[PDB]
Amino acid sequence: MTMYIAFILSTIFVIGFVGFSSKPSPIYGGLGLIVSGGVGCGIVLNFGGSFLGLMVFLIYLGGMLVVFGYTTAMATEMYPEVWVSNKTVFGAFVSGLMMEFCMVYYALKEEEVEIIFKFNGLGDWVIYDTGDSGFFSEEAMGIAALYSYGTWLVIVTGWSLLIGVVVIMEITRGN
């Protein structure tokens, strides 16, 4: 397990997930989700998915911004909660951290199956492919191929987006 970079980034990913999963003020939940989105971008970049990581990071920094806008208006509280300002939020945060730590310790020192199967470790570098060819990016062409190959996907996605705009208009009508 060389430089532990992928493992460290995954651990930070889970830590941010625990952070926004304990349900504190939507402000800090958004902060934790931004952190997890950034580290997930890093994880994907380490595997060769530069466009997908940037795209996910780019998509999240926008949706979270809208959420920040909605939280200031409707999710506001006179006293907003942080991870140490409340008993149950701190309890959930500590429980998540300890579950992370115990699963990591058991899977690293031992080889135990949690739900599906077990693991050995030795780093994520082993699963690589040593593929040596190309004046292009395989990910770029795969993503690029949607227009040429995924005509049906483009059709259903565009219809879904237009329908979603209509749905938002109709739902927020009120009266």
Ligand X SMILES: CCCCCCCC/C=C\CCCCCCCC(=O)O[C@H](COC(=O)CCCCCCC/C=C/CCCCCCCC)COP(=O)(O)OCCN
Ligand Y SMILES: CCCCCCCCCCCCCCCCCC(=O)OC[C@H](COP(=O)([O-])OCC(O)COP(=O)([O-])OC[C@@H](COC(=O)CCCCCCCCCCCCCCCCC)OC(=O)CCCCCCCCCCCCCCCCC)OC(=O)CCCCCCCCCCCCCCCCC
Ligand Z SMILES: CCCCCCCCCCCCCCCCC[C@@H](O)O[C@H](CO[C@H](O)CCCCCCCCCCCCCCC)COP(=O)(O)OCC[N+](C)(C)C
List Cα–Cα distances, 92 to 46, 54, 88, in angstroms.
31, 31, 6
Interface with ligand Z in residues 34-93 (CB under 6 A) = none
List CB contacts of 68: < 8 A, sequence separation 6 or more: 26, 27, 30
Size of the residue set binding other proteins (CB under 8 A)? 135
Q: Does 152 bind ligand Z (CB under 6 A)?
A: yes
Residues 91-130, mask of contacts with ligand Z (x by CB under 6 A): ----------------------------------------
Applying CB under 6 A, the site for ligand Y has a residue count of 12
Binding ligand Z by CB under 6 A: which of 159, 161, 166, 167?
A: 159
Q: What is the 3-state secondary structure (H, E, C) of 131-146?
A: CCCCCCCHHHHHHHCH
Tell me the C-alpha distance between 20 and 32, whole Å: 5
Q: Does 72 contact other proteins by CB under 8 A?
A: yes
Cβ atoms of 33 and 3 closer than 8 Å: no
**Does 50 interact with ligand X (rule: CB under 6 A)?**
yes
- Encoded tokens for 156: 């259903």
Give residues 111-170 in contact with other proteins (rule: CB under 8 A): 114-170
Determine if 52 is a binding residue for ligand X (CB under 6 A). no
Residue 34 interacts with, from ligand Z, ligand X, ligand Y, none (CB under 5-8 Å by kind): ligand Y
Residue whose entry in the numeric block shows the structure tokens 């942080």 = 82
Amino acid at 46: N
Distance CA 29, CA 23 (A): 7
Binding positions for ligand Z, rule: CB under 6 A: 148-149, 151-152, 155, 159
Binding positions for ligand X, rule: CB under 6 A: 12, 35, 38-39, 41-42, 45-46, 50
